[PDB]
Amino acid sequence: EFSLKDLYAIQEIQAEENLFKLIVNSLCPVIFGHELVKAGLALALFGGSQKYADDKNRIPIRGDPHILVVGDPGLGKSQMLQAACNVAPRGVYVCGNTTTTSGLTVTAGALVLGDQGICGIDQFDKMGNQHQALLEAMEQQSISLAKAGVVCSLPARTSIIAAANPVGGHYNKAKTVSENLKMGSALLSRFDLVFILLDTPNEHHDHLLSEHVIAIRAKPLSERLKVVPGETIDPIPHQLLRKYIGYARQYVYPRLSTEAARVLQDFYLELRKQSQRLNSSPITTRQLESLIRLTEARARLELREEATKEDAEDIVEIMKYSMLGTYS
Amino acid sequence: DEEVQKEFEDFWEYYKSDPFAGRNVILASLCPQVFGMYLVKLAVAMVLAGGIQRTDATGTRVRGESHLLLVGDPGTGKSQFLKYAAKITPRSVLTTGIGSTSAGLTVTEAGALVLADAGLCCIDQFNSLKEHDRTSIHEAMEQQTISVAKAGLVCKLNTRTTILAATNPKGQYDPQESVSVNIALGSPLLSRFDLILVLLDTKNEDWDRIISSFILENKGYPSKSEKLWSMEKMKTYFCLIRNLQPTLSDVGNQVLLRYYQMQRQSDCRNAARTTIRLLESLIRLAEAHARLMFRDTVTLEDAITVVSVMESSMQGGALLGGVNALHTSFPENPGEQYQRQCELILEKLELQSLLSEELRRLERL
Numbered sequence: 001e002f003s004l005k006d007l008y009a010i011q012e013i014q015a016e017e018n019l020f021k022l023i024v025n026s027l028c029p030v031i032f033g034h035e036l037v038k039a040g041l042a043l044a045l046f047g048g049s050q051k052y053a054d055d056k057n058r059i060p061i062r063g064d065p066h067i068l069v070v071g072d073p074g075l076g077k078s079q080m081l082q083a084a085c086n087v088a089p090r091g092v093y094v095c096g097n098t099t100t101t102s103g104l105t106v107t108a109g110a111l112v113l114g115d116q117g118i119c120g121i122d123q124f125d126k127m128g129n130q131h132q133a134l135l136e137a138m139e140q141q142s143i144s145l146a147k148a149g150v151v152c153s154l155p156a157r158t159s160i161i162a163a164a165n166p167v168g169g170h171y172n173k174a175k176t177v178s179e180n181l182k183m184g185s186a187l188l189s190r191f192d193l194v195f196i197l198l199d200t201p202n203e204h205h206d207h208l209l210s211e212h213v214i215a216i217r218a219k220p221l222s223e224r225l226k227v228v229p230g231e232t233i234d235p236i237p238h239q240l241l242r243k244y245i246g247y248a249r250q251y252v253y254p255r256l257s258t259e260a261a262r263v264l265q266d267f268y269l270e271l272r273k274q275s276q277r278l279n280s281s282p283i284t285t286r287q288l289e290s291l292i293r294l295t296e297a298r299a300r301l302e303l304r305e306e307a308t309k310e311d312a313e314d315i316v317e318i319m320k321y322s323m324l325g326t327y328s
Numbered sequence: 329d330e331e332v333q334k335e336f337e338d339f340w341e342y343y344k345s346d347p348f349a350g351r352n353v354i355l356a357s358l359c360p361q362v363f364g365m366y367l368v369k370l371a372v373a374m375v376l377a378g379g380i381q382r383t384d385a386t387g388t389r390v391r392g393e394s395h396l397l398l399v400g401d402p403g404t405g406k407s408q409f410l411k412y413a414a415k416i417t418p419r420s421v422l423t424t425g426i427g428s429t430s431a432g433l434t435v436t437e438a439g440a441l442v443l444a445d446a447g448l449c450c451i452d453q454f455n456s457l458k459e460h461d462r463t464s465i466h467e468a469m470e471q472q473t474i475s476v477a478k479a480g481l482v483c484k485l486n487t488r489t490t491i492l493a494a495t496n497p498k499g500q501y502d503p504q505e506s507v508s509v510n511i512a513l514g515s516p517l518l519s520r521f522d523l524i525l526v527l528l529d530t531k532n533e534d535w536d537r538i539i540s541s542f543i544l545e546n547k548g549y550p551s552k553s554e555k556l557w558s559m560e561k562m563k564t565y566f567c568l569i570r571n572l573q574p575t576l577s578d579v580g581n582q583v584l585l586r587y588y589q590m591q592r593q594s595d596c597r598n599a600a601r602t603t604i605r606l607l608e609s610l611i612r613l614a615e616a617h618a619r620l621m622f623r624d625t626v627t628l629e630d631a632i633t634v635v636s637v638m639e640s641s642m643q644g645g646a647l648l649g650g651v652n653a654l655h656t657s658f659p660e661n662p663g664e665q666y667q668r669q670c671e672l673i674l675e676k677l678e679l680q681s682l683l684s685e686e687l688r689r690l691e692r693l
């Protein structure tokens with residue numbers, strides 16, 4: 001139960017002008033850059049809604065996303081995840097070399113302990129035998145006994161966040177996408193967003209990054225989140241940010257509005273007609289559900305119950321960073 | 329006890345006109361059973377000096393140690409260096425590597441890395457280190473902590489160690505075909521190692537005779553002068569300089585900050601020694617070289633000394649040239665060599681505004 005001062009602090013935090021910048025630029029302030037990648041984790045921390053339609057039979061559908069990050073080494077894709085795991089009501093961090101099939105699953109596995117939380121897994125690529133052991137837990141949203149499958153099920157609600165390295169160390173720029181990841185068409189479709197990061201030798205970016213790392217030790221939705229030097233964006237302490245997700249996850253249930261659904265319908269019908277002829281990951285009906293699940297997510301961060309056209313216009317730009325915008 | 333501090337202060341105060349003579353005498357006592365090996369005997373001291381840890385407020389903290397790796401043809405002296413460095417440091421655990429199971433390299437019971445907190449874990453025979461075991465250490469080499477959830481226990485342990493390893497070059501070594509090909513190590517692994525010094529044996533008719541005379545005449549310490557140093561004195565020295573906390577300066581950082589920007593893209597930028605984990609080491613070495621000379625203010629001299637070692641570390645492709653580590657000897661006068669190195673470096677990477685000031689400082693000293 002939350003104290004009175006807790007409610008006062010939550011109400012005060014809700015009153016900020018730009019509530020999205022103060023959350024997307026305070027999850028981890030050491031890392032410089034990577035705005036959309038941090039926005040993805042910020043969206044995934046909250047989650048979506050659970051649909052119990054047709055209560056006679058239901059067959060419920062999961063209401064939380066799954067994010068995978070793949071890119072060149074040295075970019076820093078192992079500290080955006082530590083902060084994400086730390087800022088959570090319940091989290092767990094496990095490596096991908098010291099854990100086996102009996103470890104991730106019940107034998108109480110890592111997934112069970114990460115109930116209603118995040119179970120971020122590092123070094124995803126190094127796994128070669130446990131790949132076919134979580135396709136059931138991720139989709140069915142339940143896990144049964146591992147002893148000959150004699151019933152005895154137990155709930156397992158997880159929001160797996162994974163990071164991995166390409167097969168050939170550095171990822172070269174003249175191949176096909178499918179052979180640089182070593183993944184089938186079954187495990188590459190469950191995940192909601194699959195960001196691909198490159199490391200190129202620019203000039204201004206390096207000059208800013210070196211200055212930032214030397215100082216430490218002594219409009220599209222890509223510029224409105226960036227900080228122009230000459231202002232203060234003082235971050236919320238993680239102690240106070242951990243007691244905001246909890247209030248947001250049990251006192252508001254968002255739902256879509258009639259205006260927002262049209263944009264998603266148009267985007268789905270535009271993706272399908274174009275990528276059914278070109279070569280890419282097949283667009284099943286899962287993406288239409290994914291857009292709904294993420295547009296509901298951008299209504300639990302600002303503590304509202306609706307989906308305006310502006311909110312549905314943000315899961316269109318962040319979506320074009322692993323799909324069409326990046327497949328080229 | 330004031331006696332030890334008084335003795336060290338006297339020793340480092342006598343050598344005031346010549347500052348590098350003290351460092352040369354310091355280095356001469358490291359592994360005194362071998363002849364030569366200037367850069368190799370300097371890199372070990374720089375690595376063993378250590379670094380400074382900087383932790384951020386909320387959750388994160390960056391590394392503050394260093395690592396080293398040696399490759400060379402059999403019959404060069406890697407084992408002597410490892411065995412000698414396993415004794416000076418207070419706490420050390422020496423393992424065989426391929427002769428050690430997974431229970432040591434990771435947690436099981438405490439293994440080897442967990443058992444060497446605030447120490448130095450020597451590792452030998454790194455060529456075929458049980459590939460699973462050789463990838464189960466990527467997390468413990470860079471974050472200084474272990475993170476496992478085996479058997480549904482959720483246990484976290486701390487491991488702050490400096491890894492010193494040496495592996496043979498499987499397959500006949502070639503001047504070309506950079507170590508990523510000859511040794512066949514993955515790019516993610518071959519990026520956390522600060523220095524990769526290549527030892528190569530070649531055609532010479534003088535080093536052969538000198539080594540033969542050294543071994544045959546049983547002449548230990550050809551410098552018959554009684555300066556040397558006992559092992560207790562060096563243990564005290566490398567357990568006492570680990571308390572000073574140096575701070576950066578302004579005549580300092582800019583040199584590294586320009587060197588990294590120029591090295592980021594010359595024409596090749598190698599393939600794996602160009603990432604951002606280079607400026608995180610070019611500082612941890614410059615701060616270590618300032619704790620070996622009894623001061624706490626990094627100046628132009630420390631940066632100019634740490635630039636050359638890193639320049640020679642990158643074998644083959646570089647910006648100045650590659651010099652073999654084996655065929656090197658102690659210079660007769662280090663001051664003139666330093667004065668030449670400063671003038672050479674500070675020209676192509678343009679900060680001539682500091683050359684005049686440094687020369688003026690060197691004049692009235």
Ligand SMILES: Nc1ncnc2c1ncn2[C@@H]1O[C@H](COP(=O)(O)OP(=O)(O)O)[C@@H](O)[C@H]1O
Nearest residue numbers: 030031032073074075076077078079213390604
């Ligand atoms: N933008 C950045 N600012 C400061 N440090 C960075 C940045 N990007 C990467 N780093 C450095 O990179 C290191 C993280 O390595 P990382 O890329 O996570 O390894 P891996 O590629 O194996 O996941 C950190 O020590 C951090 O200091």
Ligand SMILES: Nc1ncnc2c1ncn2[C@@H]1O[C@H](COP(=O)(O)OP(=O)(O)O)[C@@H](O)[C@H]1O
Nearest residue numbers: 361362363401402403404405406407408539543
């Ligand atoms: N400069 C030197 N002076 C005296 N002995 C040397 C010198 N260099 C090498 N040695 C001899 O070579 C041996 C070192 O073997 P080493 O090459 O370390 O084995 P490995 O190839 O397994 O690492 C020592 O026993 C030492 O006697």
Ligand SMILES: [Mg+2]
Nearest residue numbers: 077078122123
């Ligand atoms: Mg990582």
Ligand SMILES: [Mg+2]
Nearest residue numbers: 406407452453
């Ligand atoms: Mg040996």
